[PDB]
């Protein structure tokens, strides 16, 4: 509630040299933003040095602090600290309270220093993904024609594996491929629960694909549409999406889309992988007629960012739901990034409700600001069961 009402009152700025923001960066031992030096007393419950006086901020190593996007987020996410303390004072047994922002930075309370190279991203965590969208029925289409052989084939293999890391146990996935003929890459032949074991099989099978043949989008898409209409096995009965990993071409396949989803019940997301001189117009067209998105992955450095942005599209019907979408969800048991043992995390999305009095903009209000989250350790639950 406080994050929603504070963001609306925020006035977007463009300079910060005069008005420096004060915050504690977790990953540290700069004009435009002042840093803090906390006391860091030792405390129980947590197994590290903490400071109950302010909230730390984690910014990913590939996200530049001091940008206009980051600095503006660092300003309006300062009233959260006065709510962080009120929750901790009311419940002294409160563990990490965090705000995973869609910008990329995570603000958590109490402040503690961050834990080789740091690859942590808040937008890829299971507790963030489960609150950013509803369960899905992903079905990955992989172009294994001859034209993708070489560098753009090992980018496709990496991208598909990196995409499978964004699926929880509530989502059902399957991977297919097509070169003048559509077939599965593994032994599954239908949507599977996409748990740890099932995803490892798909990751092993994706790495063993070879690029050779003539591309045929009509047979690849007919196979995908016929696998999303099974209804003979266990499914999610929710978001039905097709992710197409290809390079380019001239075929639009409008007759397949006009036959299988005339009412547009299935979203199509298209990816253009690698550096090439093939046409991208048909690729972008499939992503606009079907309510999806078009993504570009030109190198190995763009794989991580572009394989997690489809959750922004999937969250559009969730924002328009209203307060019905504000349901607290609990994740599976996992190990905390800041070493604390086995924990489960609550979850609540945050909506952009600026200009809600007039209801006139609705241009960037279809996306979520971020996901709220509070950690509950398994030792806390074990204490309630003597």
């Amino acid at each position: 509630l406080e994050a929603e009402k504070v963001q609306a009152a925020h006035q977007w700025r463009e300079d910060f040299a005069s008005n420096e923001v004060v915050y504690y960066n977790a990953k540290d031992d700069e004009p435009g933003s002042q840093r803090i030096k906390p006391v860091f007393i030792e405390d129980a419950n947590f197994g590290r040095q903490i400071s109950y006086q302010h909230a730390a901020v984690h910014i990913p190593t590939d996200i530049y602090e001091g940008s206009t996007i980051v600095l503006n987020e660092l300003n309006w996410t300062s009233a959260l600290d006065e709510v962080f303390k009120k929750n901790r004072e009311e419940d002294p047994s409160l563990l990490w309270q965090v705000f995973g922002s869609a910008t990329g930075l995570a603000r958590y309370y109490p402040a503690s220093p961050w834990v080789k190279i740091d690859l942590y991203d808040v937008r890829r965590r299971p507790w963030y993904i489960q609150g950013a969208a509803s369960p899905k029925d992903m079905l990955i289409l992989v172009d294994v024609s001859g034209s993708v052989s070489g560098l753009t084939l090992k980018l496709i293999r990496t991208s598909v594996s990196e995409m499978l890391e964004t699926l929880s146990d509530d989502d059902f996935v399957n991977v297919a491929s097509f070169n003048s003929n559509a077939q599965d890459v593994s032994c599954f032949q239908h949507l599977v629960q996409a748990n740890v074991r099932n995803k490892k099989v798909l990751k092993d099978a994706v790495n063993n694909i070879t690029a050779k043949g003539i591309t045929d989008y009509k047979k690849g898409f007919s196979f995908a549409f016929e696998q999303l209409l099974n209804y003979n096995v266990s499914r999610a009965n929710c978001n039905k999406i097709i992710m197409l990993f290809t390079d380019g071409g001239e075929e639009r396949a409008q007759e397949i889309f006009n036959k299988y989803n005339k009412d547009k019940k299935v979203r199509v997301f298209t990816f253009s992988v690698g550096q090439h001189n093939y046409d991208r117009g048909p690729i972008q067209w499939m992503a606009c007629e079907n309510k999806g998105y078009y993504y570009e992955i030109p190198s190995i450095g763009a794989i991580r960012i572009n394989t997690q942005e489809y959750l922004d599209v999937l969250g559009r019907p969730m924002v328009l739901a209203g307060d019905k979408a504000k349901q607290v969800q609990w994740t599976n048991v996992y190990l905390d990034a800041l070493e604390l043992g086995l924990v489960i995390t609550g979850t609540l999305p945050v909506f952009n409700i600026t200009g809600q009095f007039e209801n006139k903009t609705n241009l960037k209000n279809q996306l979520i600001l971020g996901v709220m989250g509070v950690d509950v350790s398994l030792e806390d639950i074990k204490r309630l069961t003597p």
Binding site: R280, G281, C288, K291, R316, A325, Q366
Partner: peptide, 23 residues
């Protein structure tokens, strides 16, 4: 047993912002 909630195919959704219209 899967979740009982489901949020998709909203009529009010804009969906006019893909990644190819801009470029």
């Amino acid at each position: 047993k899967g979740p009982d909630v489901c949020f998709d195919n909203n009529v009010l959704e804009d969906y006019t912002d893909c990644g190819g219209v801009s470029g």
